[PDB]
Amino acid sequence: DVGTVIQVGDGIARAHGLDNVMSGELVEFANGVMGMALNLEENNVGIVILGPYTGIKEGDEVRRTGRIMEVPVGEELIGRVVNALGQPIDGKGPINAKEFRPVERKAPGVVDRQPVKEPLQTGIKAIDAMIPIGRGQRELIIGDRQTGKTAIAIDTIINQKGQDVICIYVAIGQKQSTVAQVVKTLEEHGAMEYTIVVAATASDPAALQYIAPYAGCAMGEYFRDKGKHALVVYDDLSKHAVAYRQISLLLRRPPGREAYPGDVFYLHSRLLERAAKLSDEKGGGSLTALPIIETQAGDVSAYIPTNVISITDGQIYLESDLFYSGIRPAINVGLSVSRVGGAAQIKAMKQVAGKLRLDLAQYRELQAFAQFASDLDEATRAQLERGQRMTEILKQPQYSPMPVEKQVVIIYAGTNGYLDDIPVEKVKEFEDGFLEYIESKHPDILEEIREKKALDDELEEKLKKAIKEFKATFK
Amino acid sequence: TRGRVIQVMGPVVDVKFENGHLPAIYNALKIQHKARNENEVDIDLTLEVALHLGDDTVRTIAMASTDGLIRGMEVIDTGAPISVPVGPETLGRMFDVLGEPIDEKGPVKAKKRWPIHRPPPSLSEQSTEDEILETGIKVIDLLAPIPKGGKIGLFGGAGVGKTVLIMELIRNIAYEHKGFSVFAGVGERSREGNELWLEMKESGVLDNTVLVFGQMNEPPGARFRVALTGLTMAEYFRDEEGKDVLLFIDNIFRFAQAGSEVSALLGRMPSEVGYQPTLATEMAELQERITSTRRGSITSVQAIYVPADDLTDPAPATTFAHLDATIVLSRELAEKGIYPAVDPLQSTSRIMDPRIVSEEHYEVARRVREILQRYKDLQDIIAILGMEELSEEDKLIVQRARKIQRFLSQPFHVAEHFTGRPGKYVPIEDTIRGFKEILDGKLDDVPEQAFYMVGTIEEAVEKAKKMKK
Amino acid sequence: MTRGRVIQVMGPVVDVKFENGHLPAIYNALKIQHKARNENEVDIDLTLEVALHLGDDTVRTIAMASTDGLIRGMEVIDTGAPISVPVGPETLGRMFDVLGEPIDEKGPVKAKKRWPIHRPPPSLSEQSTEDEILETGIKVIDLLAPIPKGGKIGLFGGAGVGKTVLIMELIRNIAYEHKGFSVFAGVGERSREGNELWLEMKESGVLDNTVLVFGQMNEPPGARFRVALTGLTMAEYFRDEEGKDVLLFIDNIFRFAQAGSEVSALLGRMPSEVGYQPTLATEMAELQERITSTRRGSITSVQAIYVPADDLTDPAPATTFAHLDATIVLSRELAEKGIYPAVDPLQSTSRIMDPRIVSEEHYEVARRVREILQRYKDLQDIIAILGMEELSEEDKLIVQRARKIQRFLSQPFHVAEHFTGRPGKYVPIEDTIRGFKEILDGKLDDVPEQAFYMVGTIEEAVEKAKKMKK
Amino acid sequence: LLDAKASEHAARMTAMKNATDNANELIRTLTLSYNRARQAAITQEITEIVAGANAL
Ligand SMILES: Nc1ncnc2c1ncn2[C@@H]1O[C@H](COP(=O)(O)OP(=O)(O)OP(=O)(O)O)[C@@H](O)[C@H]1O
Ligand SMILES: Nc1ncnc2c1ncn2[C@@H]1O[C@H](COP(=O)(O)OP(=O)(O)OP(=O)(O)O)[C@@H](O)[C@H]1O
Ligand SMILES: Nc1ncnc2c1ncn2[C@@H]1O[C@H](COP(=O)(O)OP(=O)(O)O)[C@@H](O)[C@H]1O
Ligand SMILES: [Mg+2]
Ligand SMILES: [Mg+2]
Ligand SMILES: [Mg+2]
C-alpha cells in the first residue's frame, strides 16, 4: 500500500511501488494533499493532484487510501456553497452530511426509465411556448460570450420556489467575483432556500475542475433515487473540456481533432446520460440537466459544441446580432429545438401553441424573401402581420417571469388573431395592460386554468367575452 | 494456463500469458474477482484481444468500465470470440453487447451460440433482384425509391430529423411486412430506446422483433462491437431459416468514432482528421455482411451522422460507396420548417433507371430535379439584383419551385408532439399524381402556404378554401 | 550540501543535480555566481527558477538572464525560497527589474520587508461585490463600455491600431482623479516608450505617487514571463497592508502568454492548438485572480492585449476574455479610415451595462446607438456592390444617422498633440449622453457628416458646421 | 421623353459598369483570403498529424 514519488510537475506526479492500487483510486501524499491514480503502467503509477502541488518533492512517500473517489450527500447541503470535493467554502461552519457516494456511476438502463410528461417551467415566454423543457430532459444553452447564457439559467432556478424542486449550480472555470455575485443574486431572490452551489474557480487545480460536474451530478442523483425532482446547471462544459485537455497532455496521452484527446465525447456522455425520468417501480424520481457552452465567433461547427449538441435532448442558441438589434432574450427559433417538445407541456399550452414553432419558421424564411421580392400577395401580407405580432409577444425583460396561467392567455389572444388591429409598437402596451386587467376584472379564468391545466369550451367563452371588453376602448 | 493484467490504460488493458499459449486475435477473455480484503472491489469484466505484442503479451479492449482493476489479477481465456445466442428464442427480447438480456423477462434458452466475427458471403452466392418498396413518404417514394434487399443511408447533421425518419420508416415498412425485424441503437440516447420499446409493447410488434442497445454512456469497446451483435442475429434468419429480414441502425458514425477513440491507445499512428489508419477496412467488414444471398434478403436502413454538415469528413465519405440508396437531410430546409428536410438534388438510388420504374415516375422525378436545380442557382441572384429585374420564365420557375419544395413536406405519425397534427400516409400513385399537377402549372393560383405539412394534393385545395381563397 | 551542479544547458532552460534527499522546492530561486579562473572562461551572476522535479536528484530550472557562457559542472546555490521582492512605501518614485533590483541608479532601497512573488488570491469570503462607474472622459468608453471601479479593463488590438496611445491617455485621466498609489508594468514592449514615460512622470511630479517595473522585448523568456507578477506583488501590498485603492497598468498581457509558450517548448512538454503550452488557461488565471478588490481596498486595472494577426480566435487573446469586467476591441478598418480611438462599438462591452447600475437615460441612449450600428452593418455587404442609390426611406435615413454617430465617437486626445496640431479634450458623461440623444432624435439631421470628426461636445459640431457654411 | 429614355439607359449602363467592377474587386480580395485559409488549414492539419505521429 506504499510508494515513493519519482516525478513532480504541473499538478501531475509519477510514483514507484503502490502494487495493489486500483484504477481510479484515491492516494495521499506526506504533505496531506490528495491525488487520483489515472494510469497504471508496468513500473509507474500516474497520479493527478487534487490541491496545491508545490510542497510535494521527488523521493517523498505516497500511501494508498483503499477507497475510490467519493463525495458526501444529503439535504443538509441545501443553502451552502461548497468545493469540488466534500468541503465548505462559505463562512457557515461544517456540513455534517450523513453518507458518502462514489463520483463515477453507470446511467439508468433502458428499462429503469419512463417517458418525460411533466413540465420544468422557466417563466420565459419563448422557451416555455416554443422550446419546452420537461422534468428529466437534458437541454443545452449555447452561444458566444456576453449573450445571456447565465441569465437564462438563473431566471429558471429563481422560478422553482413554488414547486417541490431542488436546484444545483456547478461553476466550472468561472472567475471568483462572478461566483460571489451569482450567490448574492440567488440570496436576494430567496433561491438559496432550495439550492446548492458547487464551485471550482479558474485558479483551482485542473484536477478539481474535472471532478466538479461529476460531483454536482452525484449530489443531484441522491434526491432522484429517493423520489424527489432535481435540476443541475453546468456554467461552462467548454471550460470543462479545456480543463480536460491539460492533464491528458501532461500525462502524455496522444491528441485528436483540435488538440483535445480521443475520450472527449465519452467525457460528456458519461456525465449527461445520468439525467433521466425514472419509472414507477424505481420511485418515479427525476434528474434534469442544463449544460452550457461557449463558442468562438458564434459558430456552431466545432469539436466540443458538436459533441454536446449530439448528446442533449435539444438546444437553445443565443445570437449576438439578435441581441444588438433589440431581440431579447436573443434566442434564434430556427436553430433551437426540443426532442421532447409537446409532451413536456400542459394541455392548455398544447391547445394554444402546439404549431407555433413551424408557423414562426415560415415567417423567419419570408423575411429574407420579402426584403428583395418587392411583391406581397394578400396571403403573404397576412402572415407578415401575424409573425411581427408573435415576435413582439415573445420579447421579455430580465427578472420578471410569467406564470404558465398568464402565458397561455396572451398566446391564446395572439394566435386566435384578436391582435390584428393593434399597431406593432402598441402590442407591448396591450400585453401589459390586458394582463393587469385579468388580475382585476373576473380573475376566475386565471385561477380555473391553473387548477384544470387544460383549456375547455367554458374557459374559451369566458376568455373571448373578456378580450372584447378591452378592445371596445380602441378607435 | 491463465494470464495476468500488467497495464491498465483507461479502456485498453495488457495481459501476459506465461505458458506461451496466447489467445488468438478477437478471442474473448474473462476477469472474475472476489475481494480478498476491505480495500478491494468485486469485478466482472470481458475483454477482446486486439494485437499480439512481443514478450508473451497481448493488448485487449474492455467491454465495460475498468475502474477497480489491479495489476497482477487473474485472466481466463474462453478459447473463442464473443459468442451470442441465435434462434427464434431471441424474438421479443432486448440485448446487451455480449448478447445478454437487458429486460427483466428471465434467461434466454437458445440451444446455439454464434461468434460476432464471421467471413462475409462470396461473389458466387449473392443475388440482386430489383423491385420498388413503398414507404408512404412523398419524397422517398418519388425521388429516391428504396430497393427491396438493398442498403439505404439517411445522412445528416445534429437535429435535422434522422431518428424521426427512422421511426416513421419502422412504423410504415415493418407494419406492412411479414417476416422478422432487427434494430440496433449504436451509441445513441437511452431515453429514445425506452420509448421505442414501449411503442412496440403497445402495438404488439415485439413478437416479430429483436433489439440490441449498448448506448452513449458505455466505453469505446462496447460502442463499436454492438453493430456486429445485431448483425449476427439478423444473419441466422437469412442463412439458417431462409426468411427475409429488416435491419435498422441509428448512428453508424458512433461505430467509426468508437474505433478512432481506442486506436491511439493501441499504438497505431494517426491518420487524416484524427481517424485510425484502418477506417475503410473496419467499415467494409460491417457493410459487406448485410447483403441478399440465394437463401434470403436483408433490407437495411442506416442513419449516418455528419460531424459539421460536411459530407467530406472521413467517416461519412467512406460510407457512400456501400449504399444502394442515399438520402441527405439539410438544415436549410429544417430551419424553414420543411420536414422531413430531404434534399431533392443530392438524394438518389440504384432504382432510378428507366427500365425499372414507370415512364411518368421517371419523367416527374427528372422534371422536379431540373426545376429545383434551376431555382437553386436563380434564388442567389435575386438577393442582390431584386426579383423585379428577372424575366417572366424565371418568375414562373420561382413561383412553381416554391410550391414544389413545400409539397415535399408531410406530417409523420411519430411527429404528433412536434407538429400538432395527427400524421398521414401517401401511396406512390398519389405521390406521382400530386407532383405532376404542380409541374404542369394546374395549381399556379393556390398560395405557397397551402403545402406545409399536408398529405394528398386534394387537401391543399380544401385548405385554400378554408383560408378563404 | 545545500549546493548543486549544472548538468545541461539548452538556451533559456538549465538542469541542476543536487545531493540525495536535499532538493529545492518548485518555484525556488537558485543562484550562479562564477569568477573566471582562466582566460578561456567568462564571469557570470545569474538566477534561475525551479520548474519541475525530473528524478535522479535532478531538477529543471528556467533562467532570468542570458545563459551564454555557462559551462557544465558550475556550482549552483539554493536560496531556500521563491524570487523575493522588497516592498513598502519606500518603493514609491522608483523603477525596477524582474528581480526587484533598482534600474534607476539612485542607490539601494531600505530592505524592511520582502515578499515572495508567488502567493494565493483572496478567497470568496474576502471578495467585495459593489459596482460604481469610474469616469475617464473618453466618449466611446464612457457610453458603450463604462469602467467598473475595482475591476479589470481589456484593450484588444493588432499591430499599430492605438493600444499604447489609448493607455497613455488613460494614465493622463484616471490616474489624475484616482488620487492613490499607481503602478505600471511594462511587459515585452519598447524600451524607448518606457524612457519617454519616465521623463514625463518627472516633469509632471507624478513619480512621487507611482512604481514602475520593466521587462522589455530584448529580455530572455524567463524575465518576460515573471515581470507582470513583480508589478502585482508591489500593487498588492498597498491594498492589503495600507488599505488604499490602487491602479495597475499592464501594457502587454499577451507577451506574458507568449513567453510562457516559448519556455514551455524547451521544458519538454507536449504542444496544444497553435503550438501553445498545455497550461495556458491555468498560468493566466493564477496571475489574474490576484488582481481583485476586497473589503480592505480595491485594485482597478487597465490591460492592453496584442492579437497575433487580425484574428481574435488565437489561444492567448481567446483565454483572457473570461477574466475581464470591461472589454474594448480595436479594429484596423476604423484606424485606416482615420477614426480614433479605433474602438469597435459592437464588439466592445461592459458588465455595468445593466438597468440597475447605469442611469435610465444612459441605458436607453447606449442601447439605441448599438441598434443603428448593427442595422448599418447588415446593409454594408449589399451597398459594397450596388451603392446607396437603390436604398429608400428608413434604410437610407438609418445610414445617414449611422455615419454621424460613427464620427461623433472619435475624440482628440491630449497625448496625440504630437501627431496633429488639434488640442486634446475631456468630455463629461452628461455631455456624451445629451449629444448622442440629439443625434438619435434627429435634431441635428441638417448638419453635414464632416462636422462630427475629432470634436468634444455637441455645441462644437454646431460651430464647426457654421465655419464650413455648407 | 427621347432625352429621358437615352439618359435612363446611359445612367443604367454606368451603374451596371460600377456594380460589375465592385463585384470583380470583391472576387479577387475574397480569392486571396481563401488561398490564405487553404494554406493555413494544410499547415495546421500536417502539424497535428506529425505531432501525433511523433507522440506515438
Ligand atoms: N433579456 C435581457 N435583456 C437585457 N439584458 C440582458 C438580457 N439577458 C441578458 N442581459 C444582459 O447581458 C449580459 C449577459 O451576461 P451573461 O453572463 O448572461 O452572458 P454570458 O454569455 O454567460 O457571458 P459570459 O461568458 O461573460 O458569462 C448581462 O449584462 C445581462 O444583464
Ligand atoms: N417530421 C417532423 N415534423 C416536425 N418536426 C420534426 C420532424 N422531424 C424532425 N423534427 C424536429 O427536429 C428535431 C430533430 O430531432 P431528431 O431526433 O430527429 O434529431 P436527429 O436528426 O436524429 O439527430 P440525432 O441523430 O443526433 O438524434 C425533432 O426533435 C423535432 O423538433
Ligand atoms: N488618437 C490618435 N490620433 C492619431 N493617431 C493615432 C491615434 N491613436 C493612435 N494613432 C496612431 O496609430 C499608431 C498607434 O501606436 P501605438 O499606440 O503605439 O500602437 P500599438 O497599438 O501597437 O501599441 C501610431 O502610428 C499613432 O500615431
Ligand atoms: Mg455568463
Ligand atoms: Mg438521432
Ligand atoms: Mg505599446
Q: At A200, which helix (H) or strand (E)?
A: strand A195-200
* DSSP strands (E only) in A295-374: 314-317, 337-338
Q: At what angle do helices C280-288 and A237-250 cross, to 10 degrees?
A: 120
A160-to-A122, A291, B227, B255 alpha-carbon distances in Å:
8, 18, 43, 40
The CA-to-CA distance between both ends of chain A, in Å, stands at: 87
Amino acid code (one letter) for B234: A
Count Cβ atoms within 10 A of the Cβ of residue C430 and give its class: 0-12 exposed, 13-18 middle, 19 or more buried: exposed
Strands (E), A277-386: 286-294, 314-317, 337-338
Give residue for cell 425521388.
Answer: B143
- In degrees, rounded to 5, the angle at the alpha carbon of residue C116 between the alpha carbons of residues C112 and C118 is 155
Cα separation, C81 vs C26, whole angstroms: 9
Q: Which residues on adjacent β-strands are paired with residue A404?
A: none
Least Cα separation, residue D10 to chain C (angstroms): 15
C248-to-B134, B291, C236 alpha-carbon distances in Å:
73, 72, 10
- Looking at residue C2, the DSSP 8-state letter turns out to be -
**What's the gap in Å between the CA of D52 and the closest CA on chain A?**
6
Helix/strand/coil for A205: coil
Could you tell me the three cell numbers for A226? Answer: 429517493
Cα separation values, C86 from A201, C111, C187, C230, C237, Å: 30, 6, 20, 10, 10
Cell numbers describing residue C87: 516592498
Residue A245 CB neighbours (<10 A):
24
Helix (H) or strand (E) holding A459: helix A458-471
- Mutate: best of B263, B265, B266, B269, partner D, most D CBs <10 A: B269
Which residues of C make CB contacts under 8 Å with D?
270-271, 274-275, 384-387, 389
Expressed in Å, this structure's resolution amounts to 2.6
**B180-185, strands of its sheet edge to edge:** B94-95, B209-212, B180-185, B245-250, B298-305, B151-156, B325-328, B348-349
Question: Is A262 part of the contact surface with chain D (CB cutoff 8 Å)?
Answer: no
User: What's the CA gap between C215 and C3, in Å, rounded?
Assistant: 29
C130 sits in the region (left: phi over 0; alpha: psi -120 to 50; else beta) called: beta
| CB spacing of A273 vs B217 below 8 angstroms | yes
Q: How far, in Å, from the CA of A306 to the mean position of ligand 6?
A: 39
Work out whether strand C326-329 and strand C152-157 pair parallel, antiparallel, or are unpaired.
Answer: parallel
Closest CA to A106 of C459, B102, C159, B202: B102
Active-site residue set of B: 162, 188-189
Contacts of C326 (CB under 8 A, 6+ apart): C145, C146, C147, C148, C151, C152, C153, C154, C349, C350, C351, C352
Whole-number Cα distances in Å, A52 to A67, A266, C60, C118, D39: 21, 28, 19, 12, 43
Question: Distance between CA atoms of B325 and C353, rounded to whole angstroms?
Answer: 55
- Largest Cα separation within chain C, whole Å, is 87
Residue pair C223/C185 in contact by the 8 Å Cβ criterion: no
Paired with A293 in beta bridges are: A142
For the CA atoms of chain C, what is the radius of gyration?
A: 26
Which residues, by Cβ under 5 Å, contact ligand 5, an ion? B 162-163
DSSP A122: -
Cis amide prior to B340 (ω within 30 degrees): yes
Q: Is B161 in the pocket of ligand 2 (CB under 6 A)?
A: yes
Secondary structure (3-state) at B5: strand
Q: Is the dihedral of CA B381, B384, B390, B395 positive or negative?
A: positive
| Residue A155, Ramachandran bin (φ over 0: left; ψ between -120 and 50: alpha; else beta) | alpha
Identify the bridge partners of residue C465 per DSSP, sorted by sequence position. Answer: none
Q: Which ligand is nearest to the CA of C189?
A: 6
Chain C residues with beta carbon closer than 8 angstroms to that of B384: 382, 385-386
Rounded Cα distance, C198 and C189, in Å: 14
Cell digits of residue C377: 452593418
Distance between start and end Cα atoms, chain C: 86
In this structure, are residues A69 and A85 in contact, taking their beta carbons and an 8 Å threshold? no
Q: Could you tell me if A105 and A142 are in contact, meaning their C-beta atoms sit under 8 angstroms apart?
A: no
* DSSP assignments along C312-326, one per residue: TTSHHHHHHGGG-SE
Please answer whether residues A207 and A50 qualify as being in contact, where contact means their C-beta atoms are separated by less than 8 angstroms.
Answer: yes
Nearest to C90 by CA among C67, C113, C71: C113
Q: How far is it, in rounded angstroms, from Cα B42 to Cα A52?
A: 33
Backbone angles phi, psi at A445, to 5 degrees: -60, -45
Distance (Å, whole) CA B238 – CA B245: 7
Give the residue numbers in D contacting A (CB under 8 Å), as ranges: 48, 51-52, 55-56
Q: Which three cell numbers stand for residue C4?
A: 548543486
Q: Rounded to a whole number, what is the distance in Å from the CA of C310 to chain A's nearest CA?
A: 13
For chain B, what's the residue count? 469
User: Ligand 6 centre and the CA of C87: distance in Å?
Assistant: 27
The continuous run of DSSP H or E covering B155 comes out as strand B151-156
CA distance B369 to B439: 11
Ligand 5 center to residue B307 CA distance, Å? 13
- B chain contacts of residue A265, beta-carbon cutoff 8 Å: 257, 261
Closest chain A residue to D54 measured between Cα atoms?
A: A254
Residue where the block lists cell 440485448:
B95
The number of angstroms, rounded, from the C-alpha of B271 to the middle of its chain's C-alpha atoms is 25
Q: Are B134 and B427 in contact (CB under 8 A)?
A: yes
Pairwise CA distance, residues A53 & C9, whole Å: 26
Pocket (CB within 6 angstroms of ligand 1): A 145-151, 294, 328-329, 397-398; C 353-354
Task: State the residue for C-alpha cell 468541503.
Answer: A87
Cell of C306: 496584442
Tell me whether A113 touches chain B (CB under 8 Å): yes
Q: Determine whether the shortest distance from the Cβ of B415 to ligand 2 is under 6 A.
A: yes
Cβ(A22)–Cβ(B68) below 8 Å: yes
How do beta strands B12-16 and B3-9 pair?
antiparallel
Cβ-contact C351, C148 below 8 angstroms? yes
CB within 8 Å of A98: residues ≥ 6 apart? A73, A74, A76
C-alpha distances in Å from residue C192, one per residue of A344, B286, B361, C103, C198: 66, 68, 80, 15, 10
CA distance C428 to C135: 8
Max Cα-Cα span within chain B: 87
Q: Residues for chain D: how many in total? A: 56
C-alpha span between B462 and B451 (Å, rounded): 11
Q: In chain D, which residues have their Cβ closer than 8 Å to the Cβ of A255?
A: 48, 51-52, 55
Closest C-alpha to ligand 3, atom 27: C419
D2's CB contacts (< 8 A; 6+ apart) are: none
Q: State the Cα angle at A165 between A161 and A168, rounded to 5°.
A: 100
The DSSP element (H or E) to which A48 belongs, if any, is strand A44-49
Cis preceding linkage at B427, omega within 30: no
- In one-letter notation, the amino acid at residue C213 is V
Atom nearest to A292 CA in ligand 1: 22
CA dihedral A28, A30, A33, A34 (to 10 degrees): -10
Q: Which residues 6+ apart lie within 8 Å of B466 measured at CB?
A: none
End-to-end Cα spacing for chain D: 81
Burial of C130 (C-beta count, 10 Å sphere; 0-12/13-18/19+): exposed
Whether the CB-CB separation of C58 and C7 falls below 8 Å is answered with yes
- Residues near D25 by beta carbon (within 8 Å), at least 6 away in sequence: none
* Alpha carbons C293 and C67: distance in angstroms, whole number: 39
Tell me if D49 and B272 make a contact (CB, 8 A cut-off): yes
C371 and A252: CB-CB below 8 Å? no
The distance from CA A466 to its chain's CA centroid, rounded to whole angstroms, is 38
CB atoms under 10 Å from CB of C222, counted, come to 26
> A137: which residues sit within 8 A by CB, 6+ positions away?
A116, A120, A275, A288, A289, A313, A314, A338, A339, A340, A344
CA of C94 to the centre of ligand 6 (A): 21
d(CA C372, CA A229): 46
* Residue of the CA atom closest to atom 10 of ligand 3: C162
Give the residue on A whose Cα is nearest the Cα of D41: A258
Residue among C189, C226, C404, C407 flagged as catalytic: C189
**B351 Cβ partners below 8 Å, 6+ apart?**
B130, B132, B145, B146, B147, B325, B357
- Give the ranges where B106-219 is alpha helix by DSSP (H): 138-143, 162-170, 190-203
Solving technique? cryo-EM
Is the sign of the CA dihedral B164, A322, A182, A304 positive or negative?
positive
SS3 of B51-84: EECCCCEEEEEECCCCCCCECCCEEEECCCCCEE
Do C385 and D15 touch, CB atoms closer than 8 A?
A: no
Length of chain A: 475
Extract the C-alpha cell encoding B7: 497495464
Residue A329: asked if its preceding bond is cis (omega within 30°), the reply is yes
- Lookup result for grid cell 433482384: B129
Output phi, psi for C61, to 5 deg: -130, 140
Kindly determine whether residue C278 and residue A246, on different chains, have CB atoms separated by under 8 Å: yes
Write down which chains contact chain D via at least 3 CB pairs under 8 A: A, B, C
Q: How far apart, in whole angstroms, are the C-alpha atoms of residue A218 and residue A231?
A: 12
Question: A149 CA to middle of ligand 4, Å?
Answer: 5
- The answer to whether the beta carbons of residues A354 and B355 sit under 8 Å apart is no
- Picking from B159, B346, B155, the residue whose alpha carbon sits closest to that of residue B252 is B155
Are A266 and B197 inside 8 Å of each other by CB? no
Give the closest residue to B215 by CA, choosing from A107, A313, C467, A446: A107
Contact, A171 vs A179, CB < 8 A? yes
Host H or E run for residue B378: helix B359-385
